[PDB]
Amino acid sequence: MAAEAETKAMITLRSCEGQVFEVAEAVAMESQTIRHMIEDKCADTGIPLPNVSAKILSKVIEYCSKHVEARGGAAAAADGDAPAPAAVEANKAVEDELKTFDAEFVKVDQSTLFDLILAANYLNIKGLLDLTCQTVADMIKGKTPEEIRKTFNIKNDFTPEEEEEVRRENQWAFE
Amino acid sequence: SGAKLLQILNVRVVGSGERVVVLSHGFGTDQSAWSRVLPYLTRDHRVVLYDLVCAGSVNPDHFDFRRYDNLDAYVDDLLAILDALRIPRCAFVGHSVSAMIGILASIRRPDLFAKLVLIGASPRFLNDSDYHGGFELEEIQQVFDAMGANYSAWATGYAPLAVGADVPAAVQEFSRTLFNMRPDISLHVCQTVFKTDLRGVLGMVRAPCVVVQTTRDVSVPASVAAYLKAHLGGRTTVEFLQTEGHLPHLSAPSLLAQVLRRALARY
Amino acid sequence: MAEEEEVEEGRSSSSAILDLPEPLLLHILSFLTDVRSRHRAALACGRMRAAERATRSELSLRGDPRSPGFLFLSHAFRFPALEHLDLSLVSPWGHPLLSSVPPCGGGGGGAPSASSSSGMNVYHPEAISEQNAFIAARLAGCFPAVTSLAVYCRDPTTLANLTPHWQASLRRVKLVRWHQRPPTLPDGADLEPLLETCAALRELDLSEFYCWTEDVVRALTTHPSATAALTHLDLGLAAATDGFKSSELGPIAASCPNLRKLVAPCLFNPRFSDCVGDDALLSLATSCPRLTVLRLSEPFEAAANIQREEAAITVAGLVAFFAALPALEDFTMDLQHNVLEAAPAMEALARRCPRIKFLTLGSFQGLCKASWLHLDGVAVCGGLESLYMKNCQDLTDASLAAIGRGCRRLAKFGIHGCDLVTSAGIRRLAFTLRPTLKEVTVLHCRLLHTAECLTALSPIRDRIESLEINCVWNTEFDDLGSWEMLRSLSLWFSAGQLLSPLISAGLDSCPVLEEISIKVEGDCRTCPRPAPRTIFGLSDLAGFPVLAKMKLDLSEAVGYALTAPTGQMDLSLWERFYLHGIESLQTLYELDYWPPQDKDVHHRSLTLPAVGLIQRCVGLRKLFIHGTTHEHFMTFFLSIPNLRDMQLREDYYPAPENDLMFTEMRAESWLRFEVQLNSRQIDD
């Protein structure tokens, strides 16, 4: 008997402009919006993504496949027993690898990172969302509202009498 | 005015009794130096405590150097306080320069100071011809130099000398109050006090006087108590405590409280 | 001609984070915890200001709420989503808030001689209740969703004023009082308003709220309706009590069938008949079968020299108590008396409480012996992750190995008063629990000196994150790895001991060390005067790069605060000695200091040398002093560019009474100096 190769179910993805991506369903499993439609059995012909372009879709696919791979490679606990000290070390490395994968993953331009933020919400990929959502929080961390304004190319909209008043009202912020 | 001076000089009304007693603290101290002995008279007397203008508790901005170069302005503050308290008659217990203040006040207002109790009293500190104030001009100027060059070092070298008896709690309290003093104000008022000579006015003091003298006083020779009992015009008596030092209100509260309650029974 | 077709690149790119749907921004900033960055971003833009206002859950108001500046805040100062409200730090510190009791202004015992016409303050209760209601209404408007509330309660009138606005939602309450309990209050009256108003209460806290146990019994056992519904309780009472008695605890247990968490110091001294014996233990166990967190302690005084006496608790009682409460997961039982042979008790605990995770025992002897082919006592409780021990005089290295083989899930380890433990057993336990051990605590172990203990911790030195140690200095250069995960350190020092040897002992490179606490214990008066150039060695800690938070507790350091007899050293010089080199901490961001206490002075007063020492730490952002000081020292700190959060917390029982009689800090001076500090233009 020939060995039946386990066929990872492919879910067809059709981006906003018409480009198609072939991914495993387990990759498509992560995105809750994609997940939900999978069980709706409307994914036989492929699902439209009118709000996701090819580049953001490819990077989302990259992120989701990487995190699914990390989940699979994590040493699963043996039915209620705490993992052996070797197993703990193996899983700690995968997290560190996945976290390291995450940091440079959001090391993109603001627009792409902003685009990374939107897609994970539309795709309901919380892990990608949170990684991108907190990424902005760190790059705001340690900054005054002014260079924040330049960093996002925000024009300072406060009149001097307003900005003076608000700065003193919020004096317990910086200190 | 007296009323604002009450707030400025921390004038507070406690105790009960028809007998009104005025407590004034000494050098480098404040009215809380009487706390260890405050309860003993609160039962029998309506007690009045106030802070001198030189105390660090009062705003050092309020210290008028030029008016407070003489004990006269301090007597003025005391009298304005007492008039603000509508006191027509009271006894006075003074410590150190407060004794001179009370001497001058009873001279000025004999109608108010029924009886006087003196703890560590000295009308003059500089030794004179036939007068041992216990200090010479060189010693006083050396003290000035030690304090001006280093108020911290002088105060550390002075506070155990002032307290005398080996009571670290009293020495600590005096060190606290002395260090809360302001150096320029302190030099000014010490110059005010050492220069004060009330030997010519003790006989004008009409009120009966109670002198409290310790076994050993670094600044008060026992001959000073003899001079005080000799020259004060009022019927003057000297009570001797079986303890050494200048601030028995902090070191031996029991003995001094005994003496005071004996004295304040009637006046 | 035209020759003009090359200017079409000027479109302002918008910050797409603003283009995000608003709930997404709310979600993002739901993750932001640090209030500094929160309000920085809020100041970046108005839309972000609204987002940060809506994303706040907990808050501690700083300044005087009674001040009209807080009272007249605009509608923008609005926090609908604020859950946890902390009002215990409002200005002034230590004061009754919205208290209906009139101030005791010149009320000495004595009939007022009614011949005096000058400036008598006529009390107006109507106005007082008016401002109390208005401030409560303003607080409710700013903070409508408060369910867990912390407040300083000098008197229950504060509680009566505050409860109606949040009684429907308030489920946890924290009461604060370091000042003396008002003697005129009826027994249990401090707690009655809450037992009467807040039906939603589910957790109660009184660990630091000074009061009598009898008040607790009265208020609780006479309010069974509320007590049947509570879920969490703490009874520390500022640890100013000798401990609850059995007769007090009993009816409490009766009125409360539904508790889950308890913390309570209790009278465990067997010489008292009303001590907590096994009978009280099982009565509590039966009364509250659903309990999950229990932290029980025997209050003691330092004069109790080596408590060799036994406790009123037997191993059989322990076993039965374990059986009666299957739902336990956190347990703390600290005694000064010794419980012998409690290993079978520990076995019954493991069997009857398989969910046991946190264990804390004091003076329990013979818990783990490894004296049989099988693991014994605590060595069987393999599901344990937390383990702290006090006064285990007979714990051995073989016991350590048995525990490590059994408690392979142990993450935090601690021993106190374990004289028989050597560096060999410590190193064995560290190696065995190396993947899991992350925290280790060693205090006052006689054989375990600093260098030996640091050497024995090499296997987990790369993994260890927090460390607590009492420093005992004795009278190839292998590369000892940097403390790569060690972010926190706790230090215990004898009076006069030097911090400098710590760096040499093995603690030199801690790149991730963020916070540290140093405790100095001992009578400095009996200690010989060190040389005038001797310092503690605070500058020696500058080698830690992310060192930001400091907690130097010297309140236990008792000395002649202001003058020592000839040959001894005053607390002014002691402050100079200990605080010297603090300015070396470049990243020093937070400092928590305890002024040393003199027995003769109710106050832990700060001296000027300490003022000068601290004033030069420009990087200090936060400064919390646990005492009092002179008003003339205050203006120095305005020179520090960056400090705001400064409050003299006399948070030690008894909190001294501040009534116009002390040269130390005054309330009006405090308010005007807060105006001074918030008047400085600050960095952003």
Coordinates of C-alpha atoms in Angstrom, one line a residue, chain A:
Chain A
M1 CA 0.0 0.0 0.0
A2 CA 1.4 3.4 -1.1
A3 CA 1.8 5.8 1.8
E4 CA -1.1 8.4 1.7
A5 CA 0.6 11.8 2.1
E6 CA -1.5 13.9 4.4
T7 CA -2.9 16.6 2.1
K8 CA -2.9 19.9 3.9
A9 CA -6.3 21.4 2.8
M10 CA -5.7 24.4 0.6
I11 CA -7.9 27.5 0.9
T12 CA -7.9 29.8 -2.1
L13 CA -7.4 33.5 -1.4
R14 CA -8.3 36.3 -3.9
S15 CA -6.8 39.6 -2.9
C16 CA -8.3 43.0 -3.6
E17 CA -6.8 43.5 -7.1
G18 CA -7.4 39.9 -8.2
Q19 CA -4.2 38.1 -7.2
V20 CA -4.6 34.6 -5.8
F21 CA -2.7 32.9 -2.9
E22 CA -2.7 29.2 -2.2
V23 CA -2.3 28.5 1.5
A24 CA -3.0 25.6 3.8
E25 CA -6.4 25.7 5.6
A26 CA -4.5 25.6 8.9
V27 CA -2.9 28.9 7.8
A28 CA -6.4 30.1 6.8
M29 CA -7.6 28.6 10.1
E30 CA -5.9 31.3 12.2
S31 CA -7.8 34.3 10.8
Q32 CA -11.2 34.1 12.6
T33 CA -13.0 35.8 9.7
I34 CA -11.3 33.4 7.3
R35 CA -11.9 30.6 9.9
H36 CA -15.6 31.3 10.0
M37 CA -16.1 31.3 6.3
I38 CA -14.2 28.0 6.0
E39 CA -16.9 26.2 8.0
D40 CA -19.5 28.1 5.9
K41 CA -18.2 26.0 3.0
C42 CA -18.1 29.0 0.7
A43 CA -14.3 28.6 0.3
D44 CA -14.5 25.9 -2.4
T45 CA -14.3 28.6 -5.2
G46 CA -11.9 30.9 -3.1
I47 CA -12.9 33.8 -0.8
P48 CA -12.7 37.5 -1.9
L49 CA -10.4 39.9 -0.1
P50 CA -11.5 43.2 -1.5
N51 CA -9.7 45.1 1.3
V52 CA -6.4 43.2 1.2
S53 CA -3.8 43.6 -1.4
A54 CA -1.2 41.1 -2.6
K55 CA 1.7 42.4 -0.5
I56 CA -0.1 42.7 2.8
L57 CA -1.8 39.4 2.1
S58 CA 1.6 37.7 1.5
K59 CA 3.0 39.1 4.7
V60 CA -0.1 38.1 6.6
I61 CA 0.3 34.6 5.1
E62 CA 4.0 34.7 6.2
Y63 CA 3.1 35.7 9.8
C64 CA 0.2 33.2 10.1
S65 CA 2.2 30.3 8.6
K66 CA 5.1 31.1 10.9
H67 CA 2.9 31.1 14.0
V68 CA 1.1 27.9 12.9
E69 CA 4.5 26.3 12.4
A70 CA 5.6 27.5 15.9
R71 CA 2.4 26.0 17.3
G72 CA 3.0 22.7 15.6
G73 CA 6.7 22.6 16.6
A74 CA 5.9 23.4 20.3
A75 CA 6.3 20.2 22.3
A76 CA 2.7 19.4 23.2
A77 CA 2.1 18.4 26.8
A78 CA 1.6 14.6 27.4
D79 CA -2.1 14.5 28.5
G80 CA -2.1 16.5 31.8
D81 CA 1.6 16.0 32.8
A82 CA 3.9 19.0 33.0
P83 CA 6.5 18.9 30.2
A84 CA 9.9 17.4 31.0
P85 CA 12.8 19.8 31.6
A86 CA 14.0 19.1 28.1
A87 CA 10.5 19.8 26.7
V88 CA 10.3 23.1 28.5
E89 CA 13.6 24.2 27.0
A90 CA 12.4 23.2 23.5
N91 CA 9.2 25.2 23.7
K92 CA 11.0 28.2 25.3
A93 CA 13.3 28.4 22.2
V94 CA 10.3 28.3 19.8
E95 CA 8.7 31.2 21.5
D96 CA 12.0 33.2 21.5
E97 CA 12.3 32.3 17.8
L98 CA 8.7 33.3 17.1
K99 CA 9.0 36.5 19.2
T100 CA 12.2 37.4 17.3
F101 CA 10.4 36.7 14.1
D102 CA 7.7 39.1 15.3
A103 CA 10.0 42.1 16.1
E104 CA 11.5 42.4 12.6
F105 CA 8.1 41.4 11.1
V106 CA 6.8 44.8 12.3
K107 CA 10.1 46.5 11.5
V108 CA 8.4 47.9 8.4
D109 CA 7.4 51.4 7.3
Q110 CA 4.5 53.1 9.0
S111 CA 2.1 52.7 6.1
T112 CA 2.9 49.0 5.8
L113 CA 2.8 48.6 9.5
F114 CA -0.4 50.7 9.5
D115 CA -1.6 48.4 6.7
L116 CA -0.5 45.5 8.9
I117 CA -2.7 46.8 11.7
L118 CA -5.8 47.0 9.5
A119 CA -5.6 43.6 7.8
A120 CA -5.2 41.7 11.1
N121 CA -8.4 43.4 12.3
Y122 CA -10.3 42.7 9.1
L123 CA -8.9 39.1 9.2
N124 CA -9.5 39.0 13.0
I125 CA -5.9 37.8 13.5
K126 CA -5.4 38.9 17.0
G127 CA -1.8 37.8 17.3
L128 CA -0.8 39.8 14.2
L129 CA -3.1 42.7 15.3
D130 CA -1.5 42.8 18.8
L131 CA 2.0 42.5 17.5
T132 CA 1.4 45.4 15.2
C133 CA -0.8 47.3 17.7
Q134 CA 1.9 47.2 20.4
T135 CA 4.6 47.9 17.8
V136 CA 3.1 51.4 17.4
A137 CA 2.9 51.7 21.2
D138 CA 6.6 51.1 21.6
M139 CA 7.6 53.5 18.8
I140 CA 5.5 56.1 20.6
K141 CA 7.1 55.1 23.9
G142 CA 9.7 57.6 25.3
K143 CA 8.6 60.6 23.1
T144 CA 7.1 64.0 23.6
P145 CA 3.9 64.9 21.6
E146 CA 6.0 67.1 19.4
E147 CA 8.5 64.6 17.8
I148 CA 5.5 62.3 17.9
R149 CA 3.8 64.8 15.6
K150 CA 6.8 64.8 13.2
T151 CA 7.2 61.0 13.6
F152 CA 3.7 60.4 12.3
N153 CA 4.0 63.7 10.2
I154 CA 1.2 65.1 12.4
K155 CA 0.8 68.9 12.3
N156 CA 0.5 70.3 15.8
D157 CA -3.1 71.4 16.0
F158 CA -3.1 73.1 19.4
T159 CA -3.2 76.8 19.8
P160 CA -0.6 78.1 22.2
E161 CA -3.2 79.0 24.8
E162 CA -4.8 75.6 24.4
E163 CA -1.5 73.7 24.3
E164 CA -0.2 75.6 27.3
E165 CA -3.4 74.9 29.3
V166 CA -3.5 71.2 28.4
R167 CA 0.2 70.7 29.1
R168 CA -0.2 72.0 32.7
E169 CA -3.5 70.2 33.3
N170 CA -1.7 66.9 32.4
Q171 CA 1.5 67.7 34.4
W172 CA 1.2 64.4 36.2
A173 CA 2.0 62.7 32.9
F174 CA 5.8 63.1 32.4
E175 CA 6.4 63.0 36.2

